[PDB]
Amino acid sequence: AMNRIDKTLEKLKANRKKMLSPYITAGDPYPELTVSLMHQLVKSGADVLELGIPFSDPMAEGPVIQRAMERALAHSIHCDDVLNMVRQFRKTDTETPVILMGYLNPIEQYGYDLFAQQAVEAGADGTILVDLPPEEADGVSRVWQKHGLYSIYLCSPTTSAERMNFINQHANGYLYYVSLALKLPELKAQYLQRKAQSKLPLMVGFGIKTPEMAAQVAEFADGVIVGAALINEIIEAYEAKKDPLQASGALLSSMRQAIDNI
């Protein structure tokens, strides 16, 4: 089988088009908006969608994501609810790759094989498990492989030689680059250095707040991941009693254009 992620990245690579991937938390600010948001993001230029599974103990996330998860958990949105959203999305979008981002604990509670099976059946193409270090990922990788689910791994300026060895023979699709006062030339230097160690394309997954910054990064990077900025744009629209679809659409579309004109 050919994974949606590989199909999408091949087309982008052939056209010298940089990947743009928004993150949103499923269920935030309320469950009925999530699928509509997903479709809006695609309309506004998303190549890949990152959909977050809310978790009760996100000690690793920044304040913006933390609050998003709290809002989603107020509606009791869990793994099965997120898969139902993916199913609904897939009714009118079969091309766009969907990546599920979450913590390991709800999934292990759910059951690895059962989760992988249902996630693939629902129409998800891969997962980012934020608290699963590569050293611990062997059981998961084998189960994911069985169902054709892709594992998206994180790396950083300080990813060790052996960990990189762990990432290269189990990762598929692409890698997620994060640095943790970091400036653009340092980011560029460290990114290109890490990219040289990776078999896969490397997407920058932090610090992208504006169309300008998105373009500056896309100038050297394979792709860009936008999280906190979009979440903030959406919840600010909701709290101001304005259309969150308009707000998120305008933001992502301005990033799409900035990147493509860069």
C-alpha positions as a Markdown table, in Angstrom:
| # | Residue | x | y | z |
|---|---|---|---|---|
| 1 | Ala | 0.0 | 0.0 | 0.0 |
| 2 | Met | 1.1 | 3.6 | -0.6 |
| 3 | Asn | 0.5 | 5.9 | 2.4 |
| 4 | Arg | -1.2 | 9.2 | 1.8 |
| 5 | Ile | 1.8 | 11.0 | 3.4 |
| 6 | Asp | 4.2 | 9.6 | 0.8 |
| 7 | Lys | 1.9 | 10.4 | -2.1 |
| 8 | Thr | 1.5 | 14.0 | -0.9 |
| 9 | Leu | 5.2 | 14.6 | -0.2 |
| 10 | Glu | 6.2 | 13.2 | -3.6 |
| 11 | Lys | 4.0 | 15.7 | -5.4 |
| 12 | Leu | 5.3 | 18.6 | -3.2 |
| 13 | Lys | 8.9 | 17.5 | -3.7 |
| 14 | Ala | 8.5 | 17.3 | -7.5 |
| 15 | Asn | 7.1 | 20.8 | -7.6 |
| 16 | Arg | 9.6 | 22.4 | -5.2 |
| 17 | Lys | 6.6 | 23.2 | -3.0 |
| 18 | Lys | 7.2 | 23.5 | 0.7 |
| 19 | Met | 4.8 | 21.6 | 3.1 |
| 20 | Leu | 2.4 | 23.6 | 5.2 |
| 21 | Ser | 0.9 | 21.6 | 8.1 |
| 22 | Pro | -1.5 | 23.2 | 10.7 |
| 23 | Tyr | -2.1 | 21.7 | 14.1 |
| 24 | Ile | -5.5 | 21.9 | 15.9 |
| 25 | Thr | -6.7 | 20.2 | 19.0 |
| 26 | Ala | -9.7 | 18.0 | 18.3 |
| 27 | Gly | -12.8 | 19.2 | 20.2 |
| 28 | Asp | -11.5 | 22.8 | 20.6 |
| 29 | Pro | -13.4 | 25.2 | 21.2 |
| 30 | Tyr | -16.3 | 22.7 | 20.8 |
| 31 | Pro | -16.5 | 19.3 | 19.0 |
| 32 | Glu | -18.9 | 20.4 | 16.2 |
| 33 | Leu | -16.3 | 22.9 | 14.8 |
| 34 | Thr | -13.4 | 20.4 | 14.4 |
| 35 | Val | -14.4 | 18.8 | 11.0 |
| 36 | Ser | -15.4 | 22.2 | 9.6 |
| 37 | Leu | -12.0 | 23.6 | 10.7 |
| 38 | Met | -10.2 | 20.7 | 9.1 |
| 39 | His | -12.0 | 21.4 | 5.7 |
| 40 | Gln | -11.3 | 25.1 | 6.0 |
| 41 | Leu | -7.6 | 24.5 | 6.6 |
| 42 | Val | -7.5 | 22.4 | 3.4 |
| 43 | Lys | -9.3 | 25.1 | 1.5 |
| 44 | Ser | -6.8 | 27.6 | 2.8 |
| 45 | Gly | -3.7 | 25.7 | 1.7 |
| 46 | Ala | -2.9 | 22.8 | 4.2 |
| 47 | Asp | -1.0 | 19.9 | 2.7 |
| 48 | Val | -1.2 | 17.8 | 5.8 |
| 49 | Leu | -3.4 | 18.1 | 8.9 |
| 50 | Glu | -2.2 | 17.5 | 12.4 |
| 51 | Leu | -5.1 | 16.6 | 14.7 |
| 52 | Gly | -4.4 | 16.6 | 18.4 |
| 53 | Ile | -5.9 | 14.0 | 20.8 |
| 54 | Pro | -6.6 | 15.8 | 24.1 |
| 55 | Phe | -4.7 | 14.5 | 27.2 |
| 56 | Ser | -5.2 | 15.0 | 30.9 |
| 57 | Asp | -1.4 | 15.3 | 31.7 |
| 58 | Pro | 0.3 | 17.4 | 29.0 |
| 59 | Met | 3.3 | 18.5 | 31.1 |
| 60 | Ala | 5.5 | 18.9 | 28.0 |
| 61 | Glu | 3.2 | 21.3 | 26.1 |
| 62 | Gly | 3.3 | 25.1 | 26.1 |
| 63 | Pro | 0.5 | 27.2 | 27.6 |
| 64 | Val | -1.5 | 27.6 | 24.4 |
| 65 | Ile | -1.7 | 23.9 | 23.7 |
| 66 | Gln | -2.4 | 23.1 | 27.4 |
| 67 | Arg | -5.4 | 25.4 | 27.4 |
| 68 | Ala | -6.7 | 24.0 | 24.1 |
| 69 | Met | -6.6 | 20.5 | 25.6 |
| 70 | Glu | -8.4 | 21.7 | 28.7 |
| 71 | Arg | -11.2 | 23.2 | 26.6 |
| 72 | Ala | -11.5 | 19.9 | 24.6 |
| 73 | Leu | -11.5 | 17.8 | 27.7 |
| 74 | Ala | -14.4 | 19.8 | 29.1 |
| 75 | His | -16.4 | 18.1 | 26.3 |
| 76 | Ser | -14.9 | 14.7 | 27.2 |
| 77 | Ile | -13.2 | 14.4 | 23.8 |
| 78 | His | -11.1 | 11.2 | 23.7 |
| 79 | Cys | -9.6 | 8.8 | 21.2 |
| 80 | Asp | -12.8 | 7.3 | 19.8 |
| 81 | Asp | -14.3 | 10.8 | 19.4 |
| 82 | Val | -11.2 | 11.9 | 17.4 |
| 83 | Leu | -11.4 | 8.8 | 15.1 |
| 84 | Asn | -15.1 | 9.6 | 14.5 |
| 85 | Met | -14.1 | 13.1 | 13.4 |
| 86 | Val | -11.5 | 11.7 | 11.0 |
| 87 | Arg | -14.2 | 9.4 | 9.6 |
| 88 | Gln | -16.6 | 12.4 | 9.0 |
| 89 | Phe | -13.7 | 14.3 | 7.4 |
| 90 | Arg | -12.9 | 11.4 | 5.1 |
| 91 | Lys | -16.5 | 11.5 | 3.7 |
| 92 | Thr | -15.5 | 14.5 | 1.6 |
| 93 | Asp | -11.7 | 14.4 | 1.6 |
| 94 | Thr | -9.7 | 11.3 | 0.7 |
| 95 | Glu | -6.5 | 13.0 | -0.5 |
| 96 | Thr | -5.3 | 15.1 | 2.5 |
| 97 | Pro | -3.1 | 13.1 | 5.0 |
| 98 | Val | -4.2 | 13.3 | 8.5 |
| 99 | Ile | -1.7 | 12.9 | 11.4 |
| 100 | Leu | -2.9 | 12.2 | 14.9 |
| 101 | Met | -0.8 | 13.8 | 17.6 |
| 102 | Gly | -1.1 | 12.6 | 21.2 |
| 103 | Tyr | 0.4 | 11.1 | 24.3 |
| 104 | Leu | 1.2 | 7.5 | 24.7 |
| 105 | Asn | -0.9 | 6.8 | 27.7 |
| 106 | Pro | -4.4 | 7.1 | 26.3 |
| 107 | Ile | -3.3 | 4.9 | 23.3 |
| 108 | Glu | -1.8 | 2.2 | 25.5 |
| 109 | Gln | -5.0 | 2.3 | 27.6 |
| 110 | Tyr | -7.0 | 2.0 | 24.4 |
| 111 | Gly | -4.7 | -0.9 | 23.2 |
| 112 | Tyr | -2.0 | -0.5 | 20.6 |
| 113 | Asp | -3.1 | -2.9 | 18.0 |
| 114 | Leu | -6.8 | -2.0 | 18.4 |
| 115 | Phe | -5.9 | 1.7 | 18.1 |
| 116 | Ala | -3.7 | 1.2 | 15.1 |
| 117 | Gln | -6.4 | -0.9 | 13.4 |
| 118 | Gln | -9.2 | 1.6 | 14.1 |
| 119 | Ala | -7.1 | 4.7 | 13.2 |
| 120 | Val | -6.2 | 3.2 | 9.8 |
| 121 | Glu | -9.9 | 2.2 | 9.2 |
| 122 | Ala | -11.0 | 5.7 | 10.2 |
| 123 | Gly | -8.6 | 7.1 | 7.7 |
| 124 | Ala | -5.6 | 8.4 | 9.7 |
| 125 | Asp | -2.3 | 8.1 | 8.0 |
| 126 | Gly | 0.2 | 8.5 | 10.8 |
| 127 | Thr | 0.9 | 9.5 | 14.4 |
| 128 | Ile | 3.1 | 11.7 | 16.4 |
| 129 | Leu | 3.5 | 10.3 | 19.9 |
| 130 | Val | 5.0 | 13.3 | 21.8 |
| 131 | Asp | 6.1 | 11.4 | 24.9 |
| 132 | Leu | 7.5 | 8.3 | 23.3 |
| 133 | Pro | 11.3 | 8.5 | 23.1 |
| 134 | Pro | 12.8 | 6.6 | 20.1 |
| 135 | Glu | 14.5 | 4.3 | 22.6 |
| 136 | Glu | 11.1 | 3.0 | 23.8 |
| 137 | Ala | 9.3 | 2.9 | 20.4 |
| 138 | Asp | 10.1 | -0.6 | 19.2 |
| 139 | Gly | 6.8 | -2.3 | 20.2 |
| 140 | Val | 4.8 | 0.5 | 18.8 |
| 141 | Ser | 6.7 | 0.6 | 15.5 |
| 142 | Arg | 6.1 | -3.1 | 14.8 |
| 143 | Val | 2.3 | -2.7 | 15.5 |
| 144 | Trp | 2.1 | 0.4 | 13.4 |
| 145 | Gln | 4.0 | -1.3 | 10.6 |
| 146 | Lys | 1.5 | -4.2 | 10.6 |
| 147 | His | -1.4 | -1.8 | 9.9 |
| 148 | Gly | 0.5 | 0.5 | 7.6 |
| 149 | Leu | 0.3 | 3.4 | 10.0 |
| 150 | Tyr | 3.3 | 5.8 | 9.8 |
| 151 | Ser | 5.3 | 6.8 | 12.8 |
| 152 | Ile | 6.4 | 10.5 | 12.7 |
| 153 | Tyr | 9.4 | 11.0 | 15.0 |
| 154 | Leu | 10.7 | 14.2 | 16.6 |
| 155 | Cys | 14.3 | 15.4 | 16.4 |
| 156 | Ser | 16.3 | 18.4 | 17.6 |
| 157 | Pro | 19.7 | 20.1 | 17.5 |
| 158 | Thr | 20.9 | 17.6 | 20.1 |
| 159 | Thr | 19.5 | 14.2 | 18.8 |
| 160 | Ser | 22.2 | 11.7 | 19.7 |
| 161 | Ala | 23.9 | 9.5 | 17.1 |
| 162 | Glu | 22.2 | 6.3 | 18.4 |
| 163 | Arg | 18.8 | 8.0 | 18.7 |
| 164 | Met | 19.2 | 9.2 | 15.1 |
| 165 | Asn | 19.9 | 5.5 | 14.3 |
| 166 | Phe | 16.7 | 4.7 | 16.1 |
| 167 | Ile | 14.8 | 7.3 | 14.2 |
| 168 | Asn | 16.1 | 6.5 | 10.7 |
| 169 | Gln | 15.1 | 2.8 | 10.6 |
| 170 | His | 11.6 | 3.1 | 12.1 |
| 171 | Ala | 10.4 | 6.6 | 11.0 |
| 172 | Asn | 8.4 | 7.0 | 7.8 |
| 173 | Gly | 7.0 | 10.0 | 5.9 |
| 174 | Tyr | 8.7 | 12.9 | 7.5 |
| 175 | Leu | 10.5 | 14.1 | 10.7 |
| 176 | Tyr | 9.3 | 16.8 | 13.1 |
| 177 | Tyr | 12.1 | 19.3 | 14.0 |
| 178 | Val | 12.0 | 21.2 | 17.3 |
| 179 | Ser | 14.5 | 23.3 | 19.2 |
| 180 | Leu | 13.4 | 23.1 | 22.8 |
| 181 | Ala | 16.3 | 32.8 | 22.5 |
| 182 | Leu | 17.0 | 30.9 | 19.2 |
| 183 | Lys | 17.6 | 33.2 | 16.2 |
| 184 | Leu | 17.0 | 32.5 | 12.5 |
| 185 | Pro | 20.6 | 32.0 | 11.3 |
| 186 | Glu | 21.2 | 29.6 | 14.2 |
| 187 | Leu | 18.0 | 27.8 | 13.4 |
| 188 | Lys | 19.0 | 27.5 | 9.8 |
| 189 | Ala | 22.5 | 26.2 | 10.6 |
| 190 | Gln | 21.2 | 23.6 | 13.1 |
| 191 | Tyr | 18.3 | 22.6 | 11.0 |
| 192 | Leu | 20.5 | 21.9 | 7.9 |
| 193 | Gln | 22.9 | 20.0 | 10.1 |
| 194 | Arg | 20.1 | 17.8 | 11.5 |
| 195 | Lys | 18.6 | 17.3 | 8.0 |
| 196 | Ala | 22.0 | 15.9 | 6.8 |
| 197 | Gln | 21.6 | 13.1 | 9.4 |
| 198 | Ser | 18.0 | 12.3 | 8.3 |
| 199 | Lys | 16.8 | 9.9 | 5.6 |
| 200 | Leu | 13.4 | 11.7 | 5.6 |
| 201 | Pro | 12.4 | 15.3 | 4.9 |
| 202 | Leu | 12.4 | 17.5 | 8.0 |
| 203 | Met | 9.6 | 19.9 | 8.9 |
| 204 | Val | 10.1 | 22.8 | 11.3 |
| 205 | Gly | 7.6 | 22.5 | 14.1 |
| 206 | Phe | 7.9 | 25.6 | 16.3 |
| 207 | Gly | 8.1 | 29.3 | 16.3 |
| 208 | Ile | 6.0 | 30.1 | 13.3 |
| 209 | Lys | 3.7 | 32.9 | 14.3 |
| 210 | Thr | 3.4 | 35.0 | 11.2 |
| 211 | Pro | 3.3 | 34.7 | 7.3 |
| 212 | Glu | 6.7 | 36.5 | 7.4 |
| 213 | Met | 8.4 | 33.9 | 9.7 |
| 214 | Ala | 6.7 | 31.1 | 7.7 |
| 215 | Ala | 8.4 | 32.4 | 4.5 |
| 216 | Gln | 11.7 | 32.9 | 6.2 |
| 217 | Val | 11.8 | 29.4 | 7.4 |
| 218 | Ala | 10.4 | 27.8 | 4.2 |
| 219 | Glu | 13.3 | 29.4 | 2.3 |
| 220 | Phe | 15.6 | 26.7 | 3.7 |
| 221 | Ala | 13.3 | 24.1 | 5.2 |
| 222 | Asp | 11.4 | 21.2 | 3.6 |
| 223 | Gly | 8.1 | 22.3 | 5.3 |
| 224 | Val | 6.6 | 24.2 | 8.2 |
| 225 | Ile | 4.3 | 23.2 | 11.0 |
| 226 | Val | 2.0 | 25.8 | 12.6 |
| 227 | Gly | 0.5 | 25.1 | 16.0 |
| 228 | Ala | 0.1 | 27.7 | 18.7 |
| 229 | Ala | -0.5 | 30.5 | 16.2 |
| 230 | Leu | -3.5 | 28.9 | 14.6 |
| 231 | Ile | -5.0 | 27.7 | 17.9 |
| 232 | Asn | -4.7 | 31.3 | 19.2 |
| 233 | Glu | -6.3 | 32.7 | 16.1 |
| 234 | Ile | -9.2 | 30.3 | 16.4 |
| 235 | Ile | -9.9 | 30.8 | 20.1 |
| 236 | Glu | -9.5 | 34.6 | 19.8 |
| 237 | Ala | -12.1 | 34.6 | 17.1 |
| 238 | Tyr | -14.5 | 32.4 | 19.2 |
| 239 | Glu | -14.1 | 34.6 | 22.2 |
| 240 | Ala | -14.6 | 37.8 | 20.2 |
| 241 | Lys | -17.8 | 36.2 | 18.7 |
| 242 | Lys | -16.4 | 36.2 | 15.2 |
| 243 | Asp | -16.2 | 33.4 | 12.6 |
| 244 | Pro | -13.4 | 31.1 | 13.5 |
| 245 | Leu | -13.4 | 29.6 | 10.0 |
| 246 | Gln | -12.8 | 33.0 | 8.5 |
| 247 | Ala | -10.0 | 33.8 | 11.0 |
| 248 | Ser | -8.2 | 30.5 | 10.6 |
| 249 | Gly | -8.6 | 30.5 | 6.9 |
| 250 | Ala | -7.2 | 34.0 | 6.5 |
| 251 | Leu | -4.2 | 33.2 | 8.6 |
| 252 | Leu | -3.2 | 30.0 | 6.9 |
| 253 | Ser | -3.9 | 31.4 | 3.4 |
| 254 | Ser | -1.5 | 34.3 | 4.1 |
| 255 | Met | 1.1 | 31.8 | 5.1 |
| 256 | Arg | 0.5 | 29.7 | 2.0 |
| 257 | Gln | 0.9 | 32.7 | -0.2 |
| 258 | Ala | 4.0 | 34.0 | 1.7 |
| 259 | Ile | 5.6 | 30.6 | 1.4 |
| 260 | Asp | 4.8 | 30.1 | -2.3 |
| 261 | Asn | 6.1 | 33.6 | -3.1 |
| 262 | Ile | 9.3 | 32.7 | -1.3 |
